[PDB]
């Protein structure tokens, strides 16, 4: 096993997907080096839910799942097991038995237009709460009240995916924080990704 895991492709990027439709990257045979994760670029806390970054260079897993998006600063606390909210019920679900880490960092210089950013969409209203690790992208109108809308999208029928509306001149908190979550699985399976 001489390949090197491309962690320099998730953190190093320019076109992170939106929260309502994220990208799931699966890691295969390689050797991972966690030094650059915490030794260098300490923008925010490593926020490791299981085990610890200090002991992340000896144990190894089968596959690594990377999920990336951009969210609100005030919504950052919503990215944790056992919590619910406007993005933890219809947008992104974190299982209560989650293992791995979440990395958030400020992205003002990256995602900010003079008028603002509106390409990022998030779902607001939906029938029920999401199952863990499930994607529910769908273009449809919400039937609110007693009026069976047939695509009119008028009164009492609101489009769930709401434009986000970032800003480069507003105070902190609402400024975009880019979040990449790394998920692991330790099981009696043939080892595929292991560090030095």
């Amino acid at each position, epitope marked *: 096993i001489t390949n090197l895991c491309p962690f320099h*492709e998730v953190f190093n990027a320019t076109r992170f997907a939106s929260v309502y439709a994220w990208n799931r990257k699966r890691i295969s045979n390689c050797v991972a080096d966690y030094s650059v994760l915490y030794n260098f670029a300490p923008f925010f806390a490593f926020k490791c839910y299981g085990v610890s970054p200090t002991k992340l260079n000896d144990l190894c897993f089968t596959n690594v799942y990377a999920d990336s998006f951009v969210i609100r600063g005030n919504e950052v606390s919503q990215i944790a097991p056992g919590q619910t909210g406007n993005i933890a019920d219809y947008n992104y679900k974190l299982p209560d038995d989650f293992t791995g880490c979440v990395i958030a960092w400020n992205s003002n*210089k990256l995602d900010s237009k003079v008028s603002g950013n509106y390409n990022y969409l998030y779902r607001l209203f939906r029938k029920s709460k999401l199952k863990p690790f499930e994607r529910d992208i769908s273009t449809e109108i919400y039937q609110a009240g007693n009026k069976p809308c047939n695509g009119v999208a008028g009164f009492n029928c609101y489009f769930p995916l709401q434009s986000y509306g970032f800003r480069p001149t507003y105070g902190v908190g609402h400024q975009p924080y880019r979040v990449v979550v790394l998920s692991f699985e330790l099981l009696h399976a043939p080892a595929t990704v292991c560090g030095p």
Partner: antibody
Amino acid sequence: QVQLVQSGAEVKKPGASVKVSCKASGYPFTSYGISWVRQAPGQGLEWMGWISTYNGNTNYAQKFQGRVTMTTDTSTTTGYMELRRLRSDDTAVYYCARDYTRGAWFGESLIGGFDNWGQGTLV
Amino acid sequence: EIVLTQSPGTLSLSPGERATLSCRASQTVSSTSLAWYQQKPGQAPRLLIYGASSRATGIPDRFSGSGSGTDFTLTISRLEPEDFAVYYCQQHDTSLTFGGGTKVEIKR
């Protein structure tokens, strides 16, 4: 510490094919792609080729599409042009660089550029 | 494709003076996709800046970058006369296109 070396200067006549080698050392030749660029005297650079190393995907420019094909030998960690259809006044220096703009595994755009350059070869 | 526009045709400056370089875009270029390159006589180009102002290799106190959206520039201060090199700027959003270039002279 990173080292990039190539072959010596070559002289060719139109109608033949030119094979150019680029040896790389000092870094793992698996997590970075190879970018091959032209530089002709009196003008700037071009973007002939982008090649991955983990797989065989290429990103040949449409200007030279259908004429450029190059390979990678991971045993020696070398890039080979086997350029065909040589033309008279295409004499220019050739540069091989370790690219940090497109990932070698998944292929999305990166942030960066060309960080290590060879000595270039002349035909 | 996407083409870049440079109009510092020739800089007539003595060493140690302010140096401004322009890499104006055609229609739209993303903020987090750019590159700059030095070019010394009889050598190979090297990477200098890979974004807004992020340094790549050394950059002691002179090389800085700025800009936003569709315009971008590079700033040099206290120019010690060793460099006097050619400057290249590269875009990244649509395929890959180098800039025309810019010559820096001695100002005898």
